[PDB]
Amino acid sequence: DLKSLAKRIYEAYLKNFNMNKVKARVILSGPPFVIHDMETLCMAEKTLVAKLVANGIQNKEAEVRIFHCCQCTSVETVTELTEFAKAIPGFANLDLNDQVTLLKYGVYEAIFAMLSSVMNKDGMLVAYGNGFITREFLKSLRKPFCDIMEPKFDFAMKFNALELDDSDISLFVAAIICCGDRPGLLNVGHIEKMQEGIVHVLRLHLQSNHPDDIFLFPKLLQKMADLRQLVTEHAQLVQIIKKTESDAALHPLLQEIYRDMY
Ligand SMILES: CC[C@@H](Oc1cccc(CN(CCCOc2ccc(OC)cc2)c2nc3ccccc3o2)c1)C(=O)O
Numbered sequence: 408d409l410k411s412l413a414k415r416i417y418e419a420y421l422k423n424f425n426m427n428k429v430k431a432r433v434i435l436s437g438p439p440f441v442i443h444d445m446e447t448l449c450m451a452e453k454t455l456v457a458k459l460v461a462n463g464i465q466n467k468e469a470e471v472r473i474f475h476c477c478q479c480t481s482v483e484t485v486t487e488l489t490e491f492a493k494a495i496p497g498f499a500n501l502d503l504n505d506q507v508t509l510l511k512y513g514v515y516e517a518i519f520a521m522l523s524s525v526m527n528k529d530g531m532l533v534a535y536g537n538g539f540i541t542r543e544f545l546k547s548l549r550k551p552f553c554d555i556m557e558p559k560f561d562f563a564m565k566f567n568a569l570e571l572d573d574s575d576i577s578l579f580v581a582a583i584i585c586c587g588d589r590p591g592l593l594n595v596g597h598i599e600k601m602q603e604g605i606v607h608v609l610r611l612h613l614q615s616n617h618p619d620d621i622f623l624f625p626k627l628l629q630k631m632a633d634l635r636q637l638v639t640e641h642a643q644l645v646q647i648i649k650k651t652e653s654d655a656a657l658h659p660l661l662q663e664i665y666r667d668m669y
Contacts, residue, residue, distance in 0.1 A: 412496065413578060413612045416605075419494030420577035423487045427573050428524040431532055435525075439532060439539040445469060448544070455534045470552040471654045473545075476533070477555070478658050484521070485514050485660065488584070495581050497601035501594060508591050509598070511664055513584040515641065516634040520580060523563035531556070551648060555641075562637055566630060569623065575616060578609040579627055583634070639669045 421427065440451045448469060452460045456476060460466050467475070489510055492498050498506065525532040530541040545556045571579070585602035587595055613623045620626075642665055648655045657665070 409608050409611050412604075412608050413574070416494055416581050416608070417574045417577045419491055420573065420580065423491040424521065425483070425487065425535060426521070426525060426532075428571075428576060429573060430536065431525045434532060434536045435527060435539075439537055442533070442538055442540040443530075443544050448473075448540075451534075451538050455537055467654050470548045471652065473548070474552060474555075474648065474652075474655050478661055480533075481515075481518060482658055482660055484518050485510070485664070488514050488517055488580075491580070492584050495584060495601065496604055497597065498584070501597060501601075505593050505598065508589055509584055509586070511668065512589040513586065514664060515638040516583045516631070517580045519559055519562060519634055519637055519641075520566070520583065520630075521576065522559055523566045524576065526560055526563040526567070528560075528564060531560075551644060551651075554644060558637060558640065562633065569620075569626060569630075570617075572616070575613065578605065578612055579630075581605050582609050582627075583631060586631075642669055 440447070440454065442448050442451045449460070452472065459472055459475065466472070492506070492510065498509075501509075522531070525536075528542070530539050530544075532538070533540050542556070542560055546553050582602070582605050585598065585605050587599040587602045592598055609627070610624045613620075613627070617623045645657070645665060649657055
């Protein structure tokens with residue numbers, strides 16, 4: 408039954424996420440338009456996000472346009488994660504408020520975990536796999552926008568070195584969502600039992616799928632803690648940008664996620 412549960416989780420991930428590691432690797436293997444400088448950013452925008460640059464002199468600064476594009480992907484991924492969570496045994500049986508709380512704290516940890524699948528050491532896929540933005544270009548942006556993506560590349564290079572596949576990532580994302588220590592949960596006991604169940608599925612799956620790496624489960628527990636810290640730091644940077652960059656608006660769904668988070 409635990410093998411069946413692992414497969415159900417994987418099937419739910421394949422249905423619900425537009426991007427996965429298989430799809431990303433096909434693309435990254437060599438088509439995506441390469442964004443490596445301001446000229447190619449602007450060319451890519453004209454083809455792939457035309458509306459955002461159809462304002463002439465009224466267009467926002469390039470860094471702010473990138474900030475906006477990043478948030479759009481997060482909004483869509485939050486929708487995918489909310490539908491995915493229904494496949495987790497017990498999740499749909501929880502009080503609606505607890506569902507909201509688990510998603511509030513888990514979505515960005517899951518986002519940064521899955522973001523790793525579209526990253527290599529030189530850059531990352533964007534716009535549903537139709538662009539590839541270089542790591543060096545993102546580092547070249549004016550402060551503080553150059554500080555957004557680099558810590559996520561750093562996380563991703565080490566996470567990708569574990570050589571997880573989608574079957575593993577689906578269970579890891581389910582485990583992220585099930586954390587029983589999120590602030591403000593009502594039914595901690597039922598959430599802890601839901602978490603115990605999914606973590607048991609994850610541990611057995613990693614044992615079967617990665618017999619060569621006897622420590623992969625505790626490695627991933629540590630990655631979960633690393634992701635929590637990465638999200639805490641990211642939220643702090645987002646708040647700095649919101650307060651100091653008059654054009655860098657935050658989408659209302661994301662402002663609700665960030666509100667009172669850390
Ligand atoms: C800034 C505040 C914002 O921070 C971030 C920080 C890091 C990553 C994201 C979301 N993200 C990057 C999208 C870039 O999207 C474009 C699109 C077009 C473009 O130029 C034409 C440039 C960038 C992403 N990709 C994914 C791929 C797979 C799985 C999950 C994914 O998550 C948001 C937040 O907090 O929401």
